[PDB]
Amino acid sequence: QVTLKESGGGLVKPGGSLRLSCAASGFTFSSYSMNWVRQAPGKGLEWVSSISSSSSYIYYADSVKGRFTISRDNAKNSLYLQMNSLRAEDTAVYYCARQVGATWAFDIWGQGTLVTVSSSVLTQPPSASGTPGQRVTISCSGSSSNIGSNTVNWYQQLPGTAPKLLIYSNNQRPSGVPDRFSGSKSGTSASLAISGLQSEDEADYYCAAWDDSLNAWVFGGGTKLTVLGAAAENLYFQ
């Protein structure tokens, strides 16, 4: 059973500190780069930090540089995030995610831990909709330094759950993702097409790519896909 389990969240006053932990089980933890990704309510996924398998290479989002420190203890199968100078804007569910070596896709996500602090470079449409059976395509616009230099990943987030990897390496599907989902990339843009739309596809979809100029991951703001009513099969005139 390959799992990630976060802990350490809670209610903290602005300016306070908190240390998060993420316990890995069911795989060789020391073989993988690891990430922290957070999300505020009704907002998009925001990448926070990553650390290489042997800790040599660390990266931070500009929003947290100097305040947060990532670390790991391979002997304890644990990832950590020491958070200092917390602000209301840091309130979010914090997820840890495992990164695949060859593709950089975040293939396993934890369940999240809630941090409450109280007393997007990629462009995606905020909304998309279709009726069951229609094909819906959503785009993700970037630039030379991100989509123009690296592969695109897509994540599906069913309402109130952790994201899951949907597409990696621009157009590849992990096991379990149906062939109704397909990814494409052209120039500095990418798209996700969902053929034969089903009610179960109602979710938020996020594109992500590494940005060579920022030395950080960039996530799109997310597209909320609504699956509308089936639409009249039978009409009547009198």
Author numbering: 1 to 119, 137 to 255
Give the published text.
Mcl-1 is an anti-apoptotic member of the Bcl-2 family which binds to pro-apoptotic proteins containing the BH3 domain, a short α-helical stretch of around 16 residues. Binding of Mcl-1 to the pro-apoptotic proteins prevents apoptosis. Here, we report the characterization of an antibody fragment produced in vitro against Mcl-1 which was formatted as an scFv and a Fab.
C-terminally tagged constructs incorporating a TEV cleavage site leave five residues of the TEV recognition sequence post-cleavage, whereas N-terminally tagged and cleaved constructs leave only GS at the N-terminus.
